[PDB]
Amino acid sequence: MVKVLHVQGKKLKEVQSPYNFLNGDVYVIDDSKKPDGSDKDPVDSPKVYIWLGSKAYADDRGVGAWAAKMLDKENQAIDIDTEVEGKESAEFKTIVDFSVVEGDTPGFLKHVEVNFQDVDYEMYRVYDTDLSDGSSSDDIEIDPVPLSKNSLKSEDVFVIDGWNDIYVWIGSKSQVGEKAAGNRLARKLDTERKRTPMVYTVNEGLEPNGFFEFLEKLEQEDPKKQ
């Protein structure tokens, strides 16, 4: 009986069963109207729910919350609830049958190039993809990898960006071009941050005493896990 609306950019689009909520998206579940399409009697507690996917960004969230406000505006007896992926109330979970799937419709906001300049941590793998050609400098790729001792591999170089502290970890079996590219990446991050960071190049097995404790805290504390 309930009407379920999917935020798509600045649009609300109605969807039908089966409901597969994308975890990067926002749905508005309208439980405010009686079978025929008329507003429900305030005695029957009309409700509107805003379901927030765990990966949904501010535009999808704001479009969905404003859409619920607009339903409340036309019928003030409506009660609005926000539900969060994986912690939905027993009541919401009673009125819609749904599953949650991995997926993300991009929001409508246009991307502008501004650095928020807030503490963020990342680990990068620095590797040449073809050593058969006799150079370790011509096919360098930089991939983000999870912040963890588990991502460290002897064969490559890793840049551990702890914002103000930057470590270049040299695998004992890594190549010269990966060391050069690793150090150049650390230098670029240091330069972007007006040179305030401390930059260290460390070798595998010869890590300073603080090193692996520092890697654990970065993984726990990383304010933007992505």
Q: Which stretch binds another protein (CB under 8 A): 134-142, 152-160, 168-176, 192-200?
A: 192-200
Interface pick for another protein out of 39, 72, 204, 207 (rule CB under 8 A): 72
Interface pick for Ca ion out of 28, 29, 48, 60 (rule CB under 5 A): 60
- What 8-state DSSP symbol labels residue 7? E
Q: Which CB sits closer to Ca ion, 3 or 187?
A: 187
Cα distances (Å, whole numbers) of residue 222 to 24, 55, 133, 159:
20, 16, 38, 15
x/- letters, 121..150, toward another protein (CB under 8 A): ------------------------------
Q: Which CB sits closer to another protein, 132 or 209?
A: 209
Rounded Cα distance, 160 and 65, in Å: 38
Q: Which CB sits closer to another protein, 162 or 182?
A: 162
User: Half-sphere exposure (CA, 13 Å, Cβ side) for 61?
Assistant: 13
Handedness of CA 209, 222, 116, 123 (dihedral sign): positive
Cα distances (Å, whole numbers) of residue 81 to 49, 89, 172, 212:
5, 10, 55, 44
- Residue 58 interacts with another protein (CB under 8 A)? yes
Nearest 5 degrees, angle CA 148-CA 222-CA 146? 30
Is 78 annotated as belonging to a binding site?
yes
Interface pick for Ca ion out of 128, 160, 185, 215 (rule CB under 5 A): 128
The SS3 assignment for 130 reads coil
Is 121 annotated as belonging to a binding site?
yes
Is 133 annotated as belonging to a binding site?
yes
- Residue 66 interacts with another protein (CB under 8 A)? yes
Interface pick for another protein out of 4, 5, 22, 26 (rule CB under 8 A): 26
* Chain length of the chain: 226
- Which residues fall in the annotated binding site? 24-25, 60, 72, 76, 78-79, 81, 104-105, 120-121, 128, 130, 133, 135, 138-139, 155-156, 178, 190, 195, 222
